[PDB]
Design a protein around this motif. Structure first.
Motif, PDB file in Angstrom:
ATOM      1  N   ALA A 139       0.823  -1.204   0.000  1.00  0.00           N
ATOM      2  CA  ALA A 139       0.000   0.000   0.000  1.00  0.00           C
ATOM      3  C   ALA A 139       0.860   1.257   0.000  1.00  0.00           C
ATOM      4  O   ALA A 139       0.539   2.234  -0.688  1.00  0.00           O
ATOM      5  CB  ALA A 139      -0.942  -0.010   1.204  1.00  0.00           C
TER       6      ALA A 139
ATOM      7  N   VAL B  34      -0.668  -1.847  -7.462  1.00  0.00           N
ATOM      8  CA  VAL B  34      -1.158  -2.728  -6.412  1.00  0.00           C
ATOM      9  C   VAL B  34      -2.511  -3.314  -6.799  1.00  0.00           C
ATOM     10  O   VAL B  34      -3.255  -2.770  -7.625  1.00  0.00           O
ATOM     11  CB  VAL B  34      -1.236  -1.986  -5.068  1.00  0.00           C
TER      12      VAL B  34
ATOM     13  N   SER C  60     -11.507  -2.901  -9.124  1.00  0.00           N
ATOM     14  CA  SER C  60     -11.108  -2.355  -7.813  1.00  0.00           C
ATOM     15  C   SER C  60     -10.567  -0.940  -7.990  1.00  0.00           C
ATOM     16  O   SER C  60      -9.466  -0.797  -8.540  1.00  0.00           O
ATOM     17  CB  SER C  60     -10.060  -3.244  -7.230  1.00  0.00           C
TER      18      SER C  60
ATOM     19  N   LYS D 178      -8.504   2.058  -6.841  1.00  0.00           N
ATOM     20  CA  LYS D 178      -7.449   2.196  -5.806  1.00  0.00           C
ATOM     21  C   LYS D 178      -7.184   3.682  -5.600  1.00  0.00           C
ATOM     22  O   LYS D 178      -6.811   4.352  -6.563  1.00  0.00           O
ATOM     23  CB  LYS D 178      -6.177   1.423  -6.159  1.00  0.00           C
TER      24      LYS D 178
ATOM     25  N   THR E  84      -4.883   6.394  -4.211  1.00  0.00           N
ATOM     26  CA  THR E  84      -3.558   6.697  -3.692  1.00  0.00           C
ATOM     27  C   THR E  84      -3.616   8.054  -2.998  1.00  0.00           C
ATOM     28  O   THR E  84      -4.003   9.052  -3.612  1.00  0.00           O
ATOM     29  CB  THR E  84      -2.520   6.704  -4.814  1.00  0.00           C
TER      30      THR E  84
ATOM     31  N   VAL F 129      -1.976   3.483  -0.707  1.00  0.00           N
ATOM     32  CA  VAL F 129      -2.996   3.179  -1.703  1.00  0.00           C
ATOM     33  C   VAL F 129      -4.097   2.381  -1.022  1.00  0.00           C
ATOM     34  O   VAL F 129      -3.889   1.228  -0.625  1.00  0.00           O
ATOM     35  CB  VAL F 129      -2.407   2.413  -2.893  1.00  0.00           C
ATOM     36  N   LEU F 130      -5.273   2.987  -0.886  1.00  0.00           N
ATOM     37  CA  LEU F 130      -6.458   2.292  -0.397  1.00  0.00           C
ATOM     38  C   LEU F 130      -7.150   1.649  -1.593  1.00  0.00           C
ATOM     39  O   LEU F 130      -7.813   2.334  -2.381  1.00  0.00           O
ATOM     40  CB  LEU F 130      -7.394   3.254   0.331  1.00  0.00           C
ATOM     41  N   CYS F 131      -6.994   0.338  -1.737  1.00  0.00           N
ATOM     42  CA  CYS F 131      -7.536  -0.396  -2.873  1.00  0.00           C
ATOM     43  C   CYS F 131      -8.885  -0.984  -2.471  1.00  0.00           C
ATOM     44  O   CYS F 131      -8.946  -1.941  -1.693  1.00  0.00           O
ATOM     45  CB  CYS F 131      -6.568  -1.487  -3.324  1.00  0.00           C
TER      46      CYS F 131
ATOM     47  N   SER G 254      -7.498   5.619  -8.829  1.00  0.00           N
ATOM     48  CA  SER G 254      -6.955   4.946  -9.994  1.00  0.00           C
ATOM     49  C   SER G 254      -7.576   3.565 -10.119  1.00  0.00           C
ATOM     50  O   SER G 254      -8.067   2.987  -9.144  1.00  0.00           O
ATOM     51  CB  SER G 254      -5.429   4.840  -9.915  1.00  0.00           C
TER      52      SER G 254
ATOM     53  N   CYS H 182      -7.432  -0.497 -11.030  1.00  0.00           N
ATOM     54  CA  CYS H 182      -6.527  -1.631 -10.926  1.00  0.00           C
ATOM     55  C   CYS H 182      -6.636  -2.478 -12.192  1.00  0.00           C
ATOM     56  O   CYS H 182      -7.359  -2.140 -13.134  1.00  0.00           O
ATOM     57  CB  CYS H 182      -6.835  -2.434  -9.666  1.00  0.00           C
TER      58      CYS H 182
ATOM     59  N   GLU I  16     -13.935  -9.091  -4.794  1.00  0.00           N
ATOM     60  CA  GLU I  16     -12.528  -9.373  -4.548  1.00  0.00           C
ATOM     61  C   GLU I  16     -12.174  -9.376  -3.068  1.00  0.00           C
ATOM     62  O   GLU I  16     -11.005  -9.572  -2.722  1.00  0.00           O
ATOM     63  CB  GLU I  16     -11.654  -8.361  -5.293  1.00  0.00           C
TER      64      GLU I  16
END
Ligand SMILES: CCCCCCCCCCCCCCCC(=O)O
Ligand SMILES: CCCCCCCCCCCCCCCC(=O)O
Lengths: 269, 238, 41, 250, 269, 238, 250, 41
Positions: A19, A31, B114, B116, B118, B166-168, B216, B218, G41
């Motif tokens: 992360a 990621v 997903s 993400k 950042t 990064v919170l995905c 962003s 994934c 997911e």
């Protein structure tokens, strides 16, 4: 051709810190949800189809709507051929600076039969000549001028009531790509026409009625739909948030970055 | 000649049709293709690339630069309050609708993948603090306490040398493709940022530091059903 | 099907079955390789 | 470490101690125009070090209220050494620019610059009806500042939120972008190759790209910290090739 | 592919009791006429063709009839795209809870030439733009609004007098099936829109005349016919005995189980 | 180009046509298919599955639950009278028209196969009796005596632990496909239930027991000619 | 013998002496969501015994005049152990429910219950114009009774003949159905797997199915027989998997 | 004949020649196999 599958993950206490990245690098983190969090093995049958620039431009959109009449310069429609006239496809094409696309024009022409005092005379099926004059070519000044003799200019000569005319056009730009965005002046003195108007001068489209005249005025609307195919997008750009003002320049009125919400913590529902 | 029966789809201009048409200029020598760097063969590539999002889109701040700036401070006041909160769905959420993934989402009707986000700490180099950036899946109220956000998916951002966590959002959906348009059925979760620890600063550093969120896409991300974008409205001929 | 009935290359159906994608042009444009499992520095 | 960097393009060299990885423009390193992709039959003038060197432009003070600046390259490189001389003495020119923006700030300085090379950033006029003159967007001597709000007149729309191109500035990261966050970065290097439809274009009429340095987080420093924080652009064209020797254009 | 042949049978006095089953088990008896009674060897060349869900949905049926006029919101027809608007195909689709069908829309459009004081003016062939706005997309408010520029929205642009327009639509549901029946609220608070309206939000269909105007009012009727193909029915349901009342909900007026007969022993003829 | 002669069926919208049409959204990534249990690949599967039929559809009882209930009693009165009687043809018979096989029959014009009527004794566990469930093929009057029903096809239902006897109508037809619509030529037989023995009950058990008839389709069953169902009548726009 | 049955899902177990074969919902046994058919997911929370156990709901007296009852699952399982807790603490949930309806009646009791799990039994409003509130159809505490005749108001059409969904109740056997005939059966078990278009759905907004217990033959007992004949639903979710840990929703 | 003239899979003729059928999902959904020639119990 499907997107990458979400690999299975588990609890982790390591020094990898997936992360923790740095936007200072300018590199968007590669990621996955398996990296930051713990995810199950999900096979992503989802595919990045219809998101391809080839598929995204596959949707044909209008680029030129004009009204030319039967029975001056109002009897034929003149189009400085540019995608920027209609905002719907313009913003799509303005997602990329350079797009090397073979453009598939599909003219949609509908007669209007303008409301007049007398409209009791029925004209036979109206044929429509959609002539393309290359840049620097002879531009007609009348509906019956010599330019309409298509010795070299391509023309569908579409007749009303049939399938909409469609003539695929190859990549005709003098450069190796269509510069949708071109921050450059026409002249080397840096004075003249600034914008895509300089490089994106792909000629003109003159639409007329092949029929010489009609007993009553008929104003057919030429609705040119541009379908890019075999597209080669080369430099991506964001969509233009501001509404389009000029069709020959990127000039814009200032617009908010997004729809304002009551607060930074305002989450509806 | 050959007996041909016209299908009920004949003589129509379907916009999304793969129909070959006669060439306007046959045997036209197209200008030779050159390797222009950055060849976009899919707009999910421009979705995947980071984009500063207008988290602080409060009235007036969208005009200025403070829309992207997520304000954080070294003050005990409002520490039990979210740094920010907004809807996860990039299609209709005010924060994420005009960003790169969102702008390439409102050109479509269905979206899956997903997101993400950042988060870049744009503050003093000695300004160290711990945040709790949490995506809460839908079906429950928007997190009003840091514990509620912790109960959902979350990442603790320890601000340091990397300065970007990064919170995905791990695509917590009940359907294979969420709908870009605002509908409660495919309504996404809520992304809320809180203070896990205060933004401790030295006496010589500003307390009111700034954070930038980069939403962003994934590798999972995809869009399925194309649609004209609601953002680009044309009042009339240009 | 995939048969091209027109001689000109541009006078063909759109290549809607091509899903080639290289996000590394935009997402990973840095000269030095960046691995997510290591500090970015 | 990745933070340290050293670029020795030409005579001038740039050494940095806190600099993230250099953003190769769109992932492709600049190179001389290949014979396959060349359309000009003139013999290309290729100064390996005379023109392909780091040119340090005018340093602009990053004020607290500064909304942003833009340089229009390669026209911003006029009157800058033999690169500018070759621009003047050649009809067509190609170059891959490894811009290096230097923003030296202490550990107590808060701020972040989106240093983004936007290829063909067509700028919008302040009044949509008219078109601005060349002086309004050209960056021969000083960076042209983005205004915090909307301006009017025969100038360039300098609204920082719209980046001057009607485009969301936060989405400007779609172009080759590097962030100078004073928390981590003090310098950003973007190695942007030659980006244009035509393999070689004139370097005066057309600006190959625009380096927009947009402070997303305004410079924030407490009293006693250095107030003059300079944003210094040091751009080095790479693999610069020129065709069409002609009379100097001024 | 034919149905199972009736195997020959004979007299039997055994403990098999094929007729004696238990509906308490919930299992419908797999017995054959050879089991209960004595049957001859009949080779059943009959096949369960045209009874397949693929064949049953193969019959194209109307789902949307609306009148949009030429020369406000009455000049174009808006359709919240759902099979439930017309009862004929709705009950077919409501035979199964989930149907993963690629839907083949075949628009049938007929101009009416509304009876007026003056109808002596003949308008050329009317072209019809059937645009599809995906859910959340830009919805047009006028017949000439910017939304009609089909940059991404698919549109047939059908012209009158030709073959009826037909654009096959893939499976576009966000889920893995079209939930014809969905006993679920739109919001997780269990408050909002209850029924198929929640999940079956597949956008809108705007139908307009490509012709700008006509001398006299012409109200063409758009008759959208939905032909499901490649159907995957997944949970069967009984036909709705009650007449359909609402097109956005299953709400119904009570109806008899069957046609009442005079008596339990009343056998006509 | 290629000489093509249009057939007299060109430019028509036949409802039952297998004609390929251009895709509305080409290369649209459909949501991945999941194995949802119960995949119906033929509606004769839903015909085959049992369905309680409204045998006692006397006026008023169709509104209530007694339509399906077949009343039986431990009384000497009306023992020489049928427990019930109705027409075998599920297409137009009042009892069988709205059941699973009948509802999947009125969507068609021709039907062939063996209807099997499973009869469930919904009474006391100690309520034992013998019934005579008889399908009489057409060409003769409706059975008015138990002997007449015995002369046709019949099964003796000895009510016991199984409590469900399946009367399988053995497709006694003069044509390969009976017509769903009411026509005397393909008119089916008559299904009548009588008392072979009284429903003997202990003193502590109710005399008025109930029976449920489940008309179901066998493996032979098929429908050949599709037609719009007469049941679903739409007075106007919903 | 087939009449005896024993189901030991989780901590709670159900043993029956007169129970016909269990109706696996549509012939497919429930199972955890496979990676091929998974669209979320998040890491699935799969309590093998904490949530996958038999929950005994409120027992409703089968009166002579009772036309029917319905439970809306999984929302009927709210406030029922860790299955309800995981419902509250998760955005998406999937479960295959092996409902077990217990109706203990003597050999002198006449009656028959169609215990049918109708997937997505969209209920019709009593007044067609309006829509009923959530309380009218939700079965959190008590079964919602089908009325013998038509009712009016902002409620659910409870006409037993139309099963509340405008559908012939006798045709409800099209869905996974088991009959509790007091002649033979005293308990019906339907092992209904997760039935929905989306592989996982929220367990509050959407009710995966409805267990409708419709007395086709009303309870008939002579004087002296037990008048309180209870219809007890004991539903055990199987292979319960939840994604999207979030704040508890109430 | 069976030739698909459109690239998209959905843009093809209906699969009217597929007569696959599994009534056991509905007619025989019980866990324990039930044979008609034995008591159901
Ligand atoms: C009627 C037959 C000939 C048709 C010629 C009309 C189309 C001319 C070529 C258009 C090129 C693409 C649009 C302009 C360039 C751009 O801005 O992308
Ligand atoms: C004109 C070209 C585009 C045509 C798009 C119109 C059809 C949209 C998709 C319809 C999906 C199936 C119907 C709604 C869902 C359902 O209730 O089954």
């Amino acid at each position: 051709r499907t997107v990458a599958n979400t690999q299975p993950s588990g609890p982790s206490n390591s020094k990898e810190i997936p992360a923790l990245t740095a936007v200072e690098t300018g590199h968007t983190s590669q990621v996955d949800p398996s990296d930051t969090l713990q995810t199950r093995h999900v096979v992503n049958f989802h595919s990045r189809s219809e998101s391809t620039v080839e598929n995204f431009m596959g949707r044909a959109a209008c680029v030129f709507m004009d009204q030319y009449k039967l029975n001056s310069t109002d009897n034929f429609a003149v189009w400085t051929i540019n995608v920027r006239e209609m905002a719907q496809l313009r913003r799509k094409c303005e997602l990329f600076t350079y797009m090397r696309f073979d453009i598939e024009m599909t003219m949609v022409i509908t007669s209007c039969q303008d409301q007049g005092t007398q409209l009791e005379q029925d004209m036979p099926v109206l044929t429509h000549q959609i002539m393309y004059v290359p840049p620097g070519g002879p531009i007609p000044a009348k509906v019956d001028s010599y330019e309409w003799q298509t010795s070299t200019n391509p023309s569908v000569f579409w007749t009303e009531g049939n399938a909409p005319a469609r003539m695929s056009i190859p990549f005709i730009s003098v450069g190796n790509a269509y510069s949708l965005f071109y921050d450059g002046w026409s002249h080397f003195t840096q004075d003249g026409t600034y914008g895509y108007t300089t490089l994106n001068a792909m000629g003109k489209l003159f639409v007329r009625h092949v029929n010489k005249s009609s007993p009553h005025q008929i104003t057919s609307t030429i609705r040119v739909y541009f379908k890019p195919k075999h597209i080669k997008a080369w430099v991506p750009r964001p969509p233009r948030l501001c509404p389009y003002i000029n069709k020959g320049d990127v000039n814009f009125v200032v617009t908010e970055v997004t729809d304002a919400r009551k607060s930074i913590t305002d989450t509806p529902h | 000649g050959v007996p041909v029966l016209n299908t009920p789809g004949s003589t129509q201009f379907l916009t999304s049709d793969d129909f070959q048409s006669p060439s306007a200029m046959p045997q036209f020598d197209e200008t030779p293709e050159m390797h222009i760097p950055g060849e976009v063969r899919n707009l999910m590539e421009m979705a995947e690339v980071d984009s500063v999002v207008p988290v602080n889109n409060i009235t007036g701040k969208t005009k200025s630069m403070e829309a992207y700036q997520i304000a954080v401070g070294t003050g005990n006041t409002d520490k039990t309050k979210p740094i920010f909160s907004f809807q996860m769905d990039p299609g209709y959420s005010s924060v994420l609708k005009r960003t790169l993934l969102g702008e390439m989402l409102n050109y479509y009707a269905h979206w899956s993948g997903s997101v993400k986000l950042t988060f870049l700490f744009c503050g003093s180099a000695m300004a160290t603090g711990k945040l709790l950036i949490s995506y809460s899946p839908p079906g429950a109220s928007v997190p009003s306490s840091r514990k509620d956000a912790m109960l959902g998916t979350h990442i603790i951002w320890d601000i340091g040398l990397q300065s970007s966590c990064v919170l995905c959002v791990p695509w917590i959906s009940q359907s294979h493709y969420r709908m870009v348009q605002q509908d409660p059925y495919t309504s996404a979760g809520y992304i809320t940022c809180w203070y896990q620890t205060n933004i401790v600063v030295p006496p010589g550093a500003p307390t009111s530091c700034d954070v930038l969120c980069f939403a962003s896409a994934c590798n999972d991300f995809s869009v399925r059903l194309l649609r004209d974008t609601p953002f680009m409205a044309q009042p009339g001929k240009l | 099907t995939n048969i091209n009935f027109y001689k000109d290359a541009a006078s063909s159906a759109s290549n809607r079955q091509e899903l080639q994608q290289d996000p590394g042009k935009f997402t990973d444009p840095v000269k030095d390789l960046m691995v997510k499992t290591l500090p970015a520095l | 470490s990745d933070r340290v960097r050293s670029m020795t393009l030409g005579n001038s060299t740039i050494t940095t101690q806190e600099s993230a990885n250099v953003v190769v423009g769109y992932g492709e390193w600049p190179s001389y125009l290949s014979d396959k992709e060349a359309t000009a039959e003139d013999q290309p003038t290729q100064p390996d070090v005379a023109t392909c060197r780091f040119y340090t432009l005018e340093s602009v003070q990053w004020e607290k209220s500064s909304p942003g600046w833009w340089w229009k390259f390669p026209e911003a490189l006029k009157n800058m050494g033999l690169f500018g001389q070759n621009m003047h003495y050649h009809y067509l020119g190609r170059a891959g620019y490894t811009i290096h923006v230097q923003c030296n700030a202490s550990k107590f300085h808060q701020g972040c610059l989106l240093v983004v090379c936007v290829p063909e950033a067509e700028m919008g006029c302040a009044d949509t009806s008219t078109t601005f003159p060349a002086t309004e967007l050209t960056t021969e001597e000083e960076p042209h500042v983005f205004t915090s709000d909307s301006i009017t007149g025969k100038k360039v729309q300098a609204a920082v939120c719209n980046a001057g191109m009607g485009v969301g500035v936060g989405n400007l990261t779609i172009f080759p972008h590097q962030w100078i966050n004073l928390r981590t970065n003090n310098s950003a290097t973007i190695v942007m190759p030659y980006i244009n439809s035509v393999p070689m274009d004139n370097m005066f009429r057309h600006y190959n790209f625009t380096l927009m340095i947009i402070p997303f987080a305004p410079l924030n420093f407490n009293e006693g910290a250095t107030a003059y924080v300079p944003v210094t652009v040091t751009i080095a064209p790479m693999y610069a090739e020129y065709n069409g020797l002609r009379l100097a254009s001024t």
